[PDB]
């Protein structure tokens, strides 16, 4: 197929902003390029067809251009409902989509509040130990959350999950869970959650000693 590449993969903008996503085709697709918007848990919605033709009742602020290989979508003045993921798609040959561009709400930097939770005694009884680390209400989304047991950096035994922007206060929250058995759990001592973010001037470490 023809391979499609958008840029950036995500962008931060404020309501009122003029934003612009680009899309590249691996070969010439002429004017056969469409734009879609997709919001969380909803199907895609057609925005532009034929490079520059606004669909059904798409607001006048949306605008497409380009022919051949390089194309751009433009929102003249971003609104709150425009925060979504935008995909381009070649309709010259068999359909192929771009990887997506997430448009995110810009706000001020907000360092995370970091909390650590030992495994409950109810869980330890069942033979498994889950340690949860909670980064609360921060911005930007970019944060690094590393685990360390007896100061030894961990790999492959934790999973993260981020919420969507609070929409109220436009921040994110993050839950990392470290899973061990009751074995490497009862045998180790110091359990640390080390958090890097641009709201903090240096890595914050939340820890507890077992017992």
């Amino acid at each position: 197929d023809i391979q499609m590449t958008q840029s950036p993969s995500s962008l931060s903008a404020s309501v009122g902003d003029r934003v612009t996503i680009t899309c590249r085709a691996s070969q010439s697709i002429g004017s056969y390029l469409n734009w879609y918007q997709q919001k969380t848990g909803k199907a895609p919605k057609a925005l532009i067809y034929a490079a520059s033709s606004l669909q059904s009742g798409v607001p006048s602020r949306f605008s497409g251009s380009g022919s051949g290989t390089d194309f751009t979508l433009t929102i003249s003045s971003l609104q709150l409902e425009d925060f979504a993921t935008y995909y381009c798609q070649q309709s010259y040959s068999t359909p192929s989509f771009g990887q997506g561009t997430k448009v995110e709400i810009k706000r001020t930097v907000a360092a995370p509040s970091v909390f650590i939770f030992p495994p409950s005694d109810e869980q330890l009884k069942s033979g498994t130990a889950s340690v949860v680390c909670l980064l609360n209400n921060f911005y930007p989304r970019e944060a690094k959350v590393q685990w360390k047991v007896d100061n030894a950096l961990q790999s492959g035994n934790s999973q993260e999950s981020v919420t969507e922007q609070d929409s109220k206060d436009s921040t994110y929250s993050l839950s990392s869970t470290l899973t061990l058995s009751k074995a490497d759990y009862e045998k180790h001592k110091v359990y640390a959650c080390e958090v890097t973010h641009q709201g903090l001037s240096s890595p914050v470490t939340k820890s507890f000693n077992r017992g």
Partner: protein
């Protein structure tokens, strides 16, 4: 204009599913119909399409041989018989069409239908408390929560004090663990002084199982 879908669900690898797409609001019989899929947290890819008459069918190389696209123009319905299902066919499945004809775009899309291909079986969640604490307080605020662990399939629903608490509440997306079972946390930030003073019970409900749990998390 409306493409309304059904047929998606949970399936073992090697199993089968049949999706349906009931069209209305336009003369369905005149259009090339498509199936497009989207893997969780991924982009969009075409699966199969069919000419208006149903007389010619085409397939993505992944699904080729295993999937059968078809339609009943008397019923305005589009179908995708999915055989030899693999883990990597897990996705939301959309039916879509070029309503304009001239646009060369997918003007209409279905609401979606989730197809999950997993060898894991339907299990209910163990709910563990994330007790409030001194490593859980910062400023006035203290955080507390529930670890809803090792359930299958999605979804679970979580609320606090039966909806009487929604302020500061963050229920996170589930993570698929290497076991094939899901796990999520639901947390709430409350004032240190309300512990307690006030009772905090999280209400976990997993409807694929017949399982509802009310864990009382306390200091």
């Amino acid at each position: 204009v409306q493409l309304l879908e059904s047929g998606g669900g949970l399936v073992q690898p090697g199993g089968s599913l049949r999706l349906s797409c009931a069209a209305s609001g336009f003369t369905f019989s005149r259009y090339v119909m498509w199936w497009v899929r989207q893997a969780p947290g991924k982009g969009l890819e075409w699966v199969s399409y069919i000419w208006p008459s149903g007389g010619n069918t085409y397939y993505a190389d992944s699904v080729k041989g295993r999937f059968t696209i078809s339609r009943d123009n008397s019923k305005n319905t589009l179908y995708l018989q999915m055989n030899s299902l693999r883990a990597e066919d897990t996705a939301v499945y959309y039916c879509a069409s070029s309503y304009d004809f001239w646009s060369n775009a997918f003007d209409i899309w279905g609401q979606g239908t989730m197809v999950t291909v997993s060898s894991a079986s339907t299990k209910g969640p163990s709910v563990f408390p994330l007790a409030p604490c001194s490593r859980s307080t910062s400023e006035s605020t203290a955080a507390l929560g529930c670890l809803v662990k090792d359930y299958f399939p999605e979804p679970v629903t979580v609320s606090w004090n039966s909806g009487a608490l929604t302020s500061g509440v963050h229920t996170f997306p589930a993570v698929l663990q290497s076991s094939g079972l899901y796990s999520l946390s639901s947390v709430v930030t409350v004032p240190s002084s309300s512990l307690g003073t006030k009772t905090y019970t999280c209400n976990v409900d997993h409807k694929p199982s017949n399982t509802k749990v009310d864990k009382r998390v306390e200091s």
